Enzyme design. Structure first.
Site, mmCIF file in Angstrom:
data_model
loop_
_atom_site.group_PDB
_atom_site.id
_atom_site.type_symbol
_atom_site.label_atom_id
_atom_site.label_comp_id
_atom_site.label_asym_id
_atom_site.label_seq_id
_atom_site.Cartn_x
_atom_site.Cartn_y
_atom_site.Cartn_z
ATOM 1 N N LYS A 232 0.786 -1.231 0.000
ATOM 2 C CA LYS A 232 0.000 0.000 0.000
ATOM 3 C C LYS A 232 0.824 1.291 0.000
ATOM 4 O O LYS A 232 0.485 2.264 -0.675
ATOM 5 C CB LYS A 232 -0.928 -0.011 1.207
ATOM 6 C CG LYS A 232 -2.223 0.722 0.959
ATOM 7 C CD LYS A 232 -3.216 0.421 2.059
ATOM 8 C CE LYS A 232 -4.639 0.528 1.544
ATOM 9 N NZ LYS A 232 -4.912 1.852 0.925
ATOM 10 N N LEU B 145 3.265 1.966 -1.500
ATOM 11 C CA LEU B 145 3.782 2.254 -2.807
ATOM 12 C C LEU B 145 2.660 2.884 -3.602
ATOM 13 O O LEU B 145 1.506 2.449 -3.510
ATOM 14 C CB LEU B 145 4.338 0.998 -3.463
ATOM 15 C CG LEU B 145 5.313 0.185 -2.605
ATOM 16 C CD1 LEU B 145 6.019 -0.813 -3.491
ATOM 17 C CD2 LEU B 145 6.335 1.045 -1.876
ATOM 18 N N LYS C 49 -5.797 -8.133 -2.081
ATOM 19 C CA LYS C 49 -5.520 -9.215 -2.997
ATOM 20 C C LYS C 49 -4.102 -9.736 -2.779
ATOM 21 O O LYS C 49 -3.847 -10.939 -2.948
ATOM 22 C CB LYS C 49 -5.732 -8.749 -4.441
ATOM 23 C CG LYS C 49 -7.194 -8.488 -4.798
ATOM 24 C CD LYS C 49 -7.394 -8.387 -6.306
ATOM 25 C CE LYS C 49 -8.858 -8.199 -6.693
ATOM 26 N NZ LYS C 49 -9.278 -6.771 -6.607
ATOM 27 N N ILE D 270 -6.958 -8.015 -33.638
ATOM 28 C CA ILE D 270 -8.073 -8.484 -32.814
ATOM 29 C C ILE D 270 -8.005 -7.812 -31.463
ATOM 30 O O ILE D 270 -7.111 -8.103 -30.667
ATOM 31 C CB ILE D 270 -8.057 -10.017 -32.617
ATOM 32 C CG1 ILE D 270 -8.393 -10.718 -33.935
ATOM 33 C CG2 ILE D 270 -9.073 -10.435 -31.559
ATOM 34 C CD1 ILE D 270 -8.482 -12.227 -33.852
ATOM 35 N N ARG E 180 10.657 -12.025 -29.610
ATOM 36 C CA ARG E 180 11.468 -10.818 -29.463
ATOM 37 C C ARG E 180 12.480 -10.741 -30.599
ATOM 38 O O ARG E 180 12.525 -11.629 -31.452
ATOM 39 C CB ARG E 180 12.178 -10.813 -28.114
ATOM 40 C CG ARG E 180 11.213 -10.741 -26.930
ATOM 41 C CD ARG E 180 11.830 -10.044 -25.718
ATOM 42 N NE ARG E 180 12.179 -8.658 -26.028
ATOM 43 C CZ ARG E 180 11.314 -7.656 -26.109
ATOM 44 N NH1 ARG E 180 10.022 -7.857 -25.887
ATOM 45 N NH2 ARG E 180 11.744 -6.434 -26.411
ATOM 46 N N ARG F 283 17.862 3.133 -27.216
ATOM 47 C CA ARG F 283 18.334 3.130 -25.825
ATOM 48 C C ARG F 283 19.416 2.088 -25.565
ATOM 49 O O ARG F 283 20.036 2.109 -24.513
ATOM 50 C CB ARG F 283 17.175 2.914 -24.835
ATOM 51 C CG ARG F 283 16.171 4.059 -24.793
ATOM 52 C CD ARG F 283 15.372 4.115 -23.490
ATOM 53 N NE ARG F 283 14.512 2.946 -23.300
ATOM 54 C CZ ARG F 283 13.395 2.683 -23.985
ATOM 55 N NH1 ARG F 283 12.953 3.496 -24.939
ATOM 56 N NH2 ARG F 283 12.705 1.581 -23.718
ATOM 57 N N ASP G 119 9.459 -4.275 -31.792
ATOM 58 C CA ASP G 119 9.114 -3.968 -33.182
ATOM 59 C C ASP G 119 10.216 -3.055 -33.710
ATOM 60 O O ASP G 119 11.230 -2.882 -33.036
ATOM 61 C CB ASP G 119 7.729 -3.299 -33.274
ATOM 62 C CG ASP G 119 7.464 -2.259 -32.154
ATOM 63 O OD1 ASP G 119 8.170 -2.268 -31.113
ATOM 64 O OD2 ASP G 119 6.518 -1.440 -32.307
ATOM 65 N N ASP H 54 10.471 0.839 -34.903
ATOM 66 C CA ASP H 54 9.935 2.172 -35.175
ATOM 67 C C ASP H 54 10.964 2.996 -35.965
ATOM 68 O O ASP H 54 12.074 3.200 -35.487
ATOM 69 C CB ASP H 54 9.571 2.875 -33.854
ATOM 70 C CG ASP H 54 8.408 3.898 -34.004
ATOM 71 O OD1 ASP H 54 8.260 4.485 -35.104
ATOM 72 O OD2 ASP H 54 7.642 4.124 -33.019
HETATM 73 NA NA NA Z 1 -4.680 -7.746 -30.623
HETATM 74 NA NA NA Z 2 -0.516 3.670 -2.368
#
Ligand code: NA
Ligand code: NA
Length: 324
Positions: free
Chosen positions: A51, A53, A63, A97, A140, A174, A181, A183
């Site tokens: 929390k 964070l 959870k 899709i 990748r 970088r 992909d 670019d």
């Molecule tokens: Na998709």
């Molecule tokens: Na928080």
DNA sequence: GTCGG
DNA sequence: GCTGATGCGCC
DNA sequence: CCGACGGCGCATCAGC
């Protein structure tokens, strides 16, 4: 890695909210939370701990309390054994899709790739291609392959016209060892914001790159932007290369470096530069860097000759693509 | 879902 | 045939 | 308590 159980749970949930719920903002939230926790340098032992964070709240902490206690999450179990939901997730892995098409497909009983191949008559162009290259698109791209990809593009564009100015961005710029992909940014002296001359600038490059069979398929094209598929040439002794996603982007000359800066990532680095600049009296976006008036009112776009100048304006010291 | 006005 | 809405993928 | 949280280029379809 660290708290990988948690960061997985969260991503699994993010994807559920986007694809199945169509709740994009919950999706972003869960991501945010998975990314902070993934950055955190201890093993979380309570919800309450998490929390603290930023981006983790009541619901996610609780959870987290449950996962740690029971090794699992009861909502997720439920979902993994829902046919509608899992099927809908799966389908959205195909490029073309989205959640909308996925839901519709599964409502008329189409749930798997097999079902898709069986029904190619019910897919638009994009989806068909996504289908065609499903596995190749999840692969990748190791940095070595990229470099060969680059030289070709750079060469081919040189051949067309010597004044074109291509830069490749994304992770690759970088320095990352693998990238998702490709670019590519494109510009030319004949093209500025004002001086919008005849197009075919982007066209003739696409044309050329088809002609040397480097580009193999088109997902979309227009005056300023191209999205397609491409493949390195077959060494012939060896196994042919996997098909990859390529984007090419035509940008006015007065906006290139702002384009480059933006598209060289990351999400966080830009958001932090945009926030620093914001208070120093400048608004920067994909296209320009503009000073804010006393009243908080954007003036005109400042001239830019390089990525550096954008750092000058905000007196921020340069951060090479390497360290962003 | 989490945050901030 | 037109124009505008929406789906999709993208720092 | 309640709205913002990214905004855009292109392809496609709804509505006329
Ligand atoms: Na998709
Ligand atoms: Na928080």
């Amino acid at each position: 890695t660290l708290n990988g159980g948690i960061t997985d749970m969260l991503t699994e949930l993010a994807n559920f909210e986007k694809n199945v719920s169509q709740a994009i903002h919950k999706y972003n939230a869960y991501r945010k939370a998975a990314s902070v926790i993934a950055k955190y340098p201890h093993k979380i032992k309570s919800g309450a701990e998490a929390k603290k964070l930023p981006g983790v709240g009541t619901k996610i902490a609780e959870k987290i309390d449950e996962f740690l206690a029971t090794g699992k999450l009861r909502k997720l179990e439920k979902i993994r054994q829902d046919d509608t939901s899992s099927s809908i997730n799966f389908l959205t892995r195909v490029s073309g899709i989205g959640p909308s098409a996925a839901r519709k497909f599964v409502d008329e009983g189409i749930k798997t790739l097999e079902d898709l191949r069986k029904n190619e008559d019910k897919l638009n162009h994009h989806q068909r291609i996504g289908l065609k290259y499903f596995g190749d698109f999840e692969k990748r791209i190791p940095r070595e392959e990229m470099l060969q990809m680059q030289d070709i593009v750079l060469n081919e564009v040189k051949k067309v016209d010597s004044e074109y100015i291509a830069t490749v961005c994304g992770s690759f710029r970088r320095g990352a060892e693998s990238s998702g992909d490709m670019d590519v940014l494109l510009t030319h002296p004949s093209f500025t914001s004002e001086s919008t001359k005849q197009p075919k600038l982007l066209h003739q490059v696409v044309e050329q790159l088809q002609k040397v069979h480097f580009i193999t398929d088109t997902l979309s094209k227009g005056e300023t932007k191209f999205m397609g598929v491409c493949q390195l040439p077959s060494k012939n002794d060896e196994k042919e290369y996997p098909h990859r996603r390529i984007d090419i982007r035509l940008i006015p000359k007065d906006q290139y470096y702002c384009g480059v800066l933006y598209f060289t990532g990351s999400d966080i680095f830009n958001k932090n530069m945009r926030a620093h600049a914001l208070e120093k009296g400048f608004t920067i976006n994909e296209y320009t860097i503009r000073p804010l008036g006393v009243t908080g009112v954007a003036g005109e776009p400042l001239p830019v000759d390089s990525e550096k100048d954008i750092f000058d304006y905000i007196q921020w010291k340069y951060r090479e693509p390497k360290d962003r």
